[PDB]
Swiss-Prot record, chains A, B:
Organism: Salmonella typhimurium (strain LT2 / SGSC1412 / ATCC 700720)
Function text: This protein is a positive regulator of gene expression for the cysteine regulon, a system of 10 or more loci involved in the biosynthesis of L-cysteine from inorganic sulfate. The inducer for CysB is N-acetylserine. CysB inhibits its own transcription.
GO CC term (a single one): cytoplasm
Keyword Thylakoid: no
Entry's Gene Ontology molecular function annotations: DNA-binding transcription factor activity; transcription cis-regulatory region binding
Self-association and partners: Homotetramer.
Protein name per UniProt: HTH-type transcriptional regulator CysB
Residues included from the entire protein: 86 to 324 of 324
Family as reported in the entry's similarity comment: Belongs to the LysR transcriptional regulatory family.
Cellular compartments annotated: Cytoplasm
Lineage, broadest ranks: Bacteria, Pseudomonadati, Pseudomonadota, Gammaproteobacteria, Enterobacterales
Length: 239, 239
């Protein structure tokens, strides 16, 4: 067992979060599975990634943000995720594991810029609590964010997948699923895309519940709204 | 002792390269030097960074790319840099040291998207050699790029500053200053910006040759062209 002779190309347009933290395993299995498939990848903001699929320069958009604004794409939920706050060992917050949004708003924040990786969930949580957060660094990825938390610039709020006990052993990782709604990373493609079989394999490798029949059903409805509703009774993986 | 009472804010808008690899030292010295200065930072593409300064949302743009296209900013050369190709130990290129541009064009390339971190230097080198490069991953930062070189997707070409023997010990780092022109990281700001003294200190910390008198002279010429010409007889640091 290993190798399929399938011949074609696969153009993935995605973001730093996905590429760094969610895709390497899938991408490695894929390339070893499909020696005759030309894999191309492109990194960008969620909006550029979406534009790229919509303009026809990529097959699939994978991101949390922006994707829903392009109903010329069919969107498929892949997983749910939430944030951690992250601080150096000596920070005041390092002492608890009890994170009120009012406690957090006391601190200067290193997080994502508007339009990136669940930022809208953070604004929502602060706005509905009345609060106005003090964000001193609006970054576009979590490698930058963790760097400047490490320098003592402020309190990090990143995707939980962006921190690992072995990779980032010098950071204290406090869970924040209490104070923020979860975010949903989706995959998008044009309806006019002929879905090769290596594509179905890719989609399902990334999101197990997105089997061919689920995908085809989803593709048939002329509504992203209906597609979201289709998964309402299904669990989703969480990263 | 150590500390200046200066009150004010400093808004820096920059990129992943700078923030990850060129700024942390400077930023740390600065914050400990200026307790009453509010440091703000924003990360983005070179173009968004430049727009940010031009629209007035940041004091300084620091990037290699795009900055020169905004002559409503004064641009100051900070340093020169060049690329390395990077591969896993087992790659064919790992054997030499190494590098004809014709040898490199034989391989699938993991590098920066057009518009990022000296990409235009790479295209230039290939185009003038007649060659057409096979780029399988167009990324926006070197963390992503190094990840997918590590998975064997292809041959990395990054900024030399983005690879370190201790941080990336599992990568073979071949020098490519022979085949590519150098790139120049610049700092930009509006003429209408009152340059506080903490600002001159920052500028000079980042680029020693950009002393106050050099900066003021540069600022007085109405020409970025003339400013570039001003440094024509000076060495520049290399990162």
């Amino acid at each position: 067992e290993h190798t399929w002779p399938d011949k074609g190309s696969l153009y993935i347009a995605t973001t730093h979060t996905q590429a760094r933290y969610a895709l390497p395993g899938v991408i490695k299995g894929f390339i070893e599975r499909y020696p005759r498939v030309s894999l191309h990848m492109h990194q960008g903001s969620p909006t550029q990634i979406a534009e790229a699929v919509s303009k026809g320069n990529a097959d699939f958009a994978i991101a949390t943000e922006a994707l829903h604004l392009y109903d010329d794409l069919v969107m498929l939920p892949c997983y749910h995720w939430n944030r951690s706050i992250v601080v150096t060992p000596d920070h005041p917050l390092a002492a608890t594991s009890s994170v009120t949004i009012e406690a957090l708003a006391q601190y200067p924040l290193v997080t994502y810029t508007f339009g990136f990786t669940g930022r809208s969930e953070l604004d929502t949580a602060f706005n509905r609590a009345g609060l106005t957060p003090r964000i001193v660094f609006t970054a576009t990825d979590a490698d930058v964010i963790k760097t400047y938390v490490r320098l003592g610039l402020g309190v990090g709020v990143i995707a939980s997948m962006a921190v690992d006990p072995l990779a980032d052993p010098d950071l204290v990782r406090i869970d924040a699923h209490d104070i923020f709604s979860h975010s949903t990373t989706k995959i998008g493609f044009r309806r006019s895309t002929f879905l090769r079989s290596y594509m179905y394999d890719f989609i399902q490798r990334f999101a197990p519940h997105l089997t061919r029949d689920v995908v085809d059903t989803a593709v048939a409805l002329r509504s992203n709204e209906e597609i979201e509703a289709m998964f309402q009774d299904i669990k989703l993986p969480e990263k």
